[model samples]
Target: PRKLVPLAYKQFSPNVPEKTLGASGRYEGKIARSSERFKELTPNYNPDIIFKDEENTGADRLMTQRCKDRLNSLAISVMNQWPGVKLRVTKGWDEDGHHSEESLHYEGRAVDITTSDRDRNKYGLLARLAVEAGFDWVYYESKAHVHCSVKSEHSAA
Candidate 1:
C-alpha cells in the first residue's frame, strides 16, 4: 500500500512535563502530552489503544499504570529509531471478539505498529530495535507491520 511517509519528527510542545511517567524514557514525556491527541484519534482507532483515563474503565487491565507505561514506552522506543517514520498502533486493548481473550493486548502489555508497504523494511528494522530495546516479543506480524509485547518475563520490570 502506498503511504505518504511523514517527514516531521516528534516536536513536543511547551506544556508537557519533563517527567510524567516512566516505562523506558521518551514515553514519559510523550504520553503526558499525548492524551488529548489520543482522544482525537480514539473515535476511529481501536479501543485497545488507550491514552486518556476516560478511554476505558479503571478496572480494565489496559488502564493499569504499568500497562500504560509499557505501551507508551513501546511507541517511544520505536519512534526514537526512525524519527520521521509513519506509525500507529495497528492493534490495542479492549478489542472486539476477533481478538483472543488471552491476548496481551487486553492488558495493554502489547502493541502493534502499523507500517506502509513503502517503508516496510524500515518498520522491520524498528522491530529489530524493539527487540534490542528489551521488548519481550517483537516480530513482523505481516509484511506491512510489526507486533511487539512488553509483558514477557524478558521485559524489564
Candidate 2:
C-alpha cells in the first residue's frame, strides 16, 4: 500500500496578466495547473520547491502533462526504494516574467528535490534512481537539492 506524505504547500494556481513582447509579439501571462489526476495521486506535493526560482514562470498547459507524469513516476519510484527518505519538491512550474524565457519550470520539464536527512549518499541514490528510470538530465544544486528533467521526446538516458 502507498503511504501519504504531507505536502509542504498547497497546489498553486497563479493569475497572470497579458504582456506584449517586442513589436509583433504577444504573450498571455497564464500559469497552468497540473492535471486533476496528477493532483489526486500526489495530494501533499508542493510546487514551490520544485519551481522555486521566482524568475521561472510556471509551466504552460502544453508541457504540464508530460512533466507531471515524469515527476509522479520519479517520486513514486524513489519513495518505494527509500521509504524512510523524505523528499521535498522545491520547484515544479512557474508564470512568465522578465527572466522567464530561460526558466525550465515554465515548460514543466524540470523539478528540484532534496532529501530530508541531508545525506549525500542518499541524495546520490535518488539521483541515480531517477536517471535509471529514464530521466535524461540531473543537476546537483547547492548542497541539498537535485534538479532533474525529462527530454521532450521522453528518451531513455
lDDT of each: 0.43, 0.46
TM-score against truth, every candidate:
0.47, 0.51
- State the lDDT of candidate 2 residue by residue for 44-122, as single tens digits: 2343223334444333223445455666576667667777655556665543342356545444555666664566556
**What CA RMSD would candidate 2 show?**
12.8
Model 2's lDDT to the true fold? 0.46
lDDT of 1 by residue, 66-141 (tens): 4345445555555565565433555544434334545555444555565323465576565655555555555565
TM-score of 2: 0.51
How large is the C-alpha RMSD of every model relative to the true structure?
A: 13.5, 12.8
Worst 10 residues of 2 by lDDT: 11-20
Mark the 10 consecutive residues where model 1 has the least summed lDDT: 24-33
